[PDB]
Design a protein around this ligand. Structure first.
Ligand SMILES: Cc1cc2nc3c(=O)[nH]c(=O)nc-3n(C[C@H](O)[C@H](O)[C@H](O)COP(=O)(O)OP(=O)(O)OC[C@H]3O[C@@H](n4cnc5c(N)ncnc54)[C@H](O)[C@@H]3O)c2cc1C
Ligand SMILES: Cc1cc2nc3c(=O)[nH]c(=O)nc-3n(C[C@H](O)[C@H](O)[C@H](O)COP(=O)(O)OP(=O)(O)OC[C@H]3O[C@@H](n4cnc5c(N)ncnc54)[C@H](O)[C@@H]3O)c2cc1C
Ligand SMILES: Cc1cc2nc3c(=O)[nH]c(=O)nc-3n(C[C@H](O)[C@H](O)[C@H](O)COP(=O)(O)OP(=O)(O)OC[C@H]3O[C@@H](n4cnc5c(N)ncnc54)[C@H](O)[C@@H]3O)c2cc1C
Ligand SMILES: Cc1cc2nc3c(=O)[nH]c(=O)nc-3n(C[C@H](O)[C@H](O)[C@H](O)COP(=O)(O)OP(=O)(O)OC[C@H]3O[C@@H](n4cnc5c(N)ncnc54)[C@H](O)[C@@H]3O)c2cc1C
Lengths: 370, 369, 370, 369
């Protein structure tokens, strides 16, 4: 009766994974809405290049990317060997040499507190193409040996599998909320309450819909994103790194001759689960523009997902003011696969009472407006 | 003016009927996974049902006859593709003993229903002559007048007519609170949604927001999986509905397509998944009476959550002790037949007309303590 | 113009994989017809329990199962580490103890000269359910620790990747054949011949269509097969064994909470690439019959594949009599994922002239029928 | 009597005409991946075509106005679902200059072709009023006679009429053999297929089986990728066809569906794959002139291999020096407009009727020593 988690994406799954290790009874409930963000998550893990230069770097991006090393092994030693993860390195690009210099600097300043990045290095024209053949030969780049990739769906799935293997439960259902005597109550499909000492709301983009039932104003709305998957027949891509043109687009490669190209950021889209023409056109232009070698690659599918985009680019983590037994994790935006796993460790310490490894006040949620 | 929460077959009909009368209708629909109206098979044949509840049957048979008014009212408005057709129905039974008791039930309920046509008990092989895939050793009772419809296309057409008449439709999950004895609607952001009259046709999900008002809404979801088949290059526009009276059924549509009866999974919750045993049961039932479907293409299997109430009879009418709030739900497994006519009844409530049928026996319950 | 391979299934891919490593210039052509057998192969590798006792066929079946040990590491050391292979053991079931005793006899006789099978051990009721939870608790079984499984598509894909990394070429095209001056010619899309010293036809079920152009009578026709893929949300299956109920059906599990169930065997089906109703019913009955735990598992997809089923259960491998520069490999039927990989190694030696590890006279095709 | 190899729009048209003349028809089709007729967009508008070749345009114009006869003969036969509609056509251009030259070329060719109607030059967004997604700043030339059709449904309709008239259809990959000067057809089993006359409408794959007779058939596949869009809740049955005169195009069907011009990939072979650049080219060309399609749903991308010949002129007529063999191929990118009438000619060849059109300029070559 310890913990009840609403939503089992990368964030809700990481919370369960970390809670099950603390001996708590974890009950997970996940509807798996069409457009579940984690099912469409590209899988880039490389914070050192992010242009968002706030103290969130020291707290979430840096700390989160440093934990991937430990997490992958902790999972590997538990029977979970299919995560799609690989420390393949990353290539960062820019249109003009001027902007490419300020980015190299921003990365250099951020290697001190994250040695997993390796030895950052400046590549000349044609050298990035030797690591990612589809790239243009006239592209200079910055190589970050530490940058990795992952299959967002498989990572969350494996974390859930480890939790359920050790006394956790998972079912497919849609639950709601009610405010009882100042405490948070979870109402099942029938309508009866679901006994739980602590509740965690990691409902992603849909969180604002059930939290509003408690008088809360959750400032997280869906940001639609369309992401293209390509197939290179008979092409060994297991060693290819990730590519970050620093223009809201990106692309990476997986072992099964597969290449994924950066997604769109459609604001005010709502929950529009449709593959549109312009959306795919945007991605195809940005992709083939830097990597003409992908021209004759097969188009296998185009996934759609709704990012939990918060008002601020920083997430919303911590216990709810004025409401007992309610914690929420959301707002991961476009960096959820990188921050999600560690953010889940934070929520684990919150509901249990462990000492805060970081100051969550910068991310604490808002209370009832009344 | 009017705010409708939930745009299934029921919420859509209410908007359709109200918009035509000039009321400012604002529709908000979340489109939950498993929206019942999207998964509805579309059989309309109440005279054979084995459930004997007059309060419920009164609307079942009445809503069936209403299709005569609806199809034409929609036809004369640009809407001609609703999948509706008066193709007739075949009622089957395994042992001739049960078939006799059923032939009795049908005649007893046809007393006030000439729309059912002239019933006739068919000899072995006569049912297969109208539905070839059936096995030849099946006696049946033919009800010329039983029809089918594409519930998905019916709700879509009624919404289009409502929007063309000044209604609005947007996607959101809204809630309710008690302000001054009246029902006030809050959007996801939390801002209020001004409305003189609110209607709640949220299907199985209705018991999640009404509970915020102290109401005990006895409607929970009953999952149901339904299989769609395709006979490549086979004319099916004339095939009848088939009701083996064993919780299963099957019907046909124009596009060489055959739909097979659904499951009934109590205590499923909103488990939007296509399970194995669910499809095994449907395929065993279908292929058991219709072995001709063996080599038919399986194109998709849909899932839906029926708004199953504590009692089989629905819940319609204003909420006692709460002003400006009306509820419609509980349709269960007959919402496509009862839905359209019920929306007409919900419209009359918020508009104030005298009830074409006394709604007292369907009214909801007030706030509890 | 060293070698031209027609068809890139598991067999054509294995041949290419072996030839390219020996310096031969390999040109691979594969249309990827709908129903490609390799893309729908279940992936069971456990020959010792087979009811079919054909020495000509069994020689390659048990031989091709042992070759998997070499292949997995060979591919592993080349960057191909995600092949879905695992030595998870197998469970052999039967309804009545009478036939289960007969099966135990066949296995023992064939497990004595096969240490790869491990220590065969007869389990009591409920012990097979301890390894495959969804099974019935009343089932006796025979445990073969050596039984393994693999993802057929990922295996053939990785082989091609290693082959093309070794100077081979892969193209999507439909080619034909004509007989010119007693030697085999391959007609490209334009209709003009394609220069090639040696041709290998691994066209699977479609092989007879183009080989008939040379006066041959290739007795390999398609046998449709429908196979169901299930999903157990939040269930660790990496350690689940294979199940062989010895009733033409079967089922296995993969790492990502996925369970596959035995396939149909539709003779005279032609190239009917449809998912039928009865085909799925039969599989569901067999699966849930012995494994009620799969009842509430998700059904994610149902694949279709045309097995290259030959008149004789033994395959067809070797040069074509009276026709120079032609080599045929086909007839793998329902055991190609086990035989395919090693059978490709045989085809490689044939076309190059190396001595045959196994006398191939018993598998040679027939010559032109004047 | 007659044996047809390949059941695309060309082989189907041939079967539809032969069955009416009382010939015993046996049709065999392998339905290769990328069958051109299954991916054909279906624009019918020869008057605007830029390719001014009289040897090829003789049939293009002649075959286009044959659609009038064909639709009615099919409409008066139970076949009413052809996707055909005389919706008109809009011809656009980059600059007013090129648009002027096109208007002149169009009017010259309608003298003895009144099916085009009254051509009118639009300007300043008048074209957008008939095709909303277009840009407002586009002048155009309206050709009321331009129509569209679903090549997939048309070929099926002809076949059904042919089968209702004693024709047979089978699935197999057949070959050809020289048996004492006669053309003989061998099935997959190797046994011969008795046929008094053989017609080869094998499309791009023809060169492969004809090489078996020592013939050199200069028809190779030209891959083309085509995109289908869906406009949620938008009536498009009345929208005309659009011909930007830039190697691309787009048309609209009844079911809120819009199709965009195809790619032209030479030397592609039978590469049955949907590529990235191919879709980028079509999306750019489509949205470049029709920004309104930005938020349209992408439902499908089809691939087909055009029977592109060395010369744009097709290949029709008996094979020299080989007895009982006839060839039809080379339809290229205009097969849906020329195909139907071309099948009528192939029927006239094998039966012996006089040539309505000069066959000398299309006949194939004989064996090369
Ligand atoms: C196209 C795309 C590409 C991306 N690429 C990257 C990348 O390269 N790197 C990176 O770091 N991040 C990336 N992201 C961001 C990342 O995928 C997300 O930020 C993150 O996965 C969000 O996970 P979540 O669990 O918070 O949300 P979700 O994954 O949406 O989880 C919410 C879950 O809760 C369920 N739920 C909701 N309401 C209820 C309810 N009432 N009852 C029950 N269940 C409920 C939903 O059905 C869902 O399963 C990408 C995102 C997109 C869309
Ligand atoms: C498999 C199956 C087969 C069936 N076959 C038949 C048949 O043959 N004949 C027959 O007569 N009936 C049949 N039915 C029954 C019929 O389909 C349903 O009873 C009917 O569709 C109920 O409609 P509804 O509008 O009440 O519910 P729904 O269709 O579920 O509509 C509810 C809507 O409200 C929305 N909503 C919910 N909560 C909120 C909120 N808080 N805010 C905003 N929107 C919200 C939901 O997203 C949804 O769109 C079948 C049902 C199933 C499942
Ligand atoms: C449902 C199912 C389950 C199975 N389960 C198992 C199992 O558990 N264990 C096991 O050992 N085996 C199993 N098998 C058998 C195995 O999948 C097959 O035997 C094997 O994949 C055959 O490989 P292939 O290369 O001979 O044929 P294919 O994989 O079909 O390869 C033929 C290829 O050649 C191409 N081609 C053909 N003609 C031409 C042409 N003219 N021009 C160009 N390309 C051409 C085709 O497009 C295709 O790509 C199963 C098979 C099925 C159908
Ligand atoms: C993407 C695309 C868009 C197009 N758009 C248009 C348009 O808007 N307007 C227009 O006028 N034209 C258009 N065309 C052109 C038109 O579709 C084609 O020219 C025409 O359909 C060719 O038909 P066909 O019957 O000659 O060949 P196909 O349609 O390719 O038919 C050939 C048939 O023969 C069979 N076959 C071949 N060899 C054998 C064998 N040995 N044994 C048995 N069967 C065999 C094949 O399997 C196939 O079924 C388009 C073409 C493409 C590819």
């Amino acid at each position: 009766m310890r913990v009840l988690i609403i939503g089992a994406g990368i964030l809700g799954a990481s919370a369960a994974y970390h809670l099950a290790r603390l001996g708590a009874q974890v009950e997970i409930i996940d509807q798996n809405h069409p457009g579940k963000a984690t099912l469409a998550g590209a899988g880039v893990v490389c914070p050192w290049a992010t242009e968002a230069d706030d103290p969130d770097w020291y707290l979430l991006y840096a700390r989160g990317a440093r934990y991937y090393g430990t997490l992958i092994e902790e999972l590997r030693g538990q029977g979970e060997t299919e995560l799609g993860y690989s420390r393949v390195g990353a290539l960062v690009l820019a249109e003009d040499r001027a902007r490419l210099d300020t980015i190299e600097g921003r990365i250099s300043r951020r290697i001190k507190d994250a040695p997993e990045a390796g030895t950052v290095r400046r590549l000349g024209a044609g050298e990035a193409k030797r690591l990612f053949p589809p790239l243009r030969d006239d592209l200079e780049a910055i190589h970050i040996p530490g940058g990795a990739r992952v299959d967002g769906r498989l990572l969350a799935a494996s974390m859930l599998r480890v939790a359920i293997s050790s006394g956790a439960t998972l079912r497919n259902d849609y639950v709601s909320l009610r405010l009882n005597d100042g405490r948070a109550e979870c109402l099942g499909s029938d309508g009866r309450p679901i006994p739980a000492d602590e509740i965690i709301v990691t409902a992603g983009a849909w969180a604002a819909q059930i939290l509003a039932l408690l008088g809360l104003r959750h400032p997280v709305v869906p940001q639609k994103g369309q992401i293209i998957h390509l197939h290179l027949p008979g092409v060994a891509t297991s060693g290819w790194p990730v590519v970050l043109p620093m223009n809201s687009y990106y692309m990476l490669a997986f072992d099964d001759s597969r290449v994924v190209v950066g997604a769109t950021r459609e604001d005010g889209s709502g929950f529009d689960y449709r593959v549109t023409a312009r959306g795919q056109l945007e991605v195809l232009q940005a992709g083939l523009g830097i990597a003409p070698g992908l021209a004759d690659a097969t188009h296998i599918e185009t996934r759609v997902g709704f990012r939990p985009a918060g008002s601020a680019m920083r997430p919303i983590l911590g216990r709810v003011p004025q409401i007992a037994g309610l914690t929420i994790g959301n707002g991961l935006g476009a960096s959820g696969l990188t921050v999600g796993p560690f953010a889940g460790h934070l929520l684990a310490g919150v509901v249990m009472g462990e000492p805060a490894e970081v100051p969550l006040e910068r991310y604490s949620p808002t209370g009832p407006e009344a």
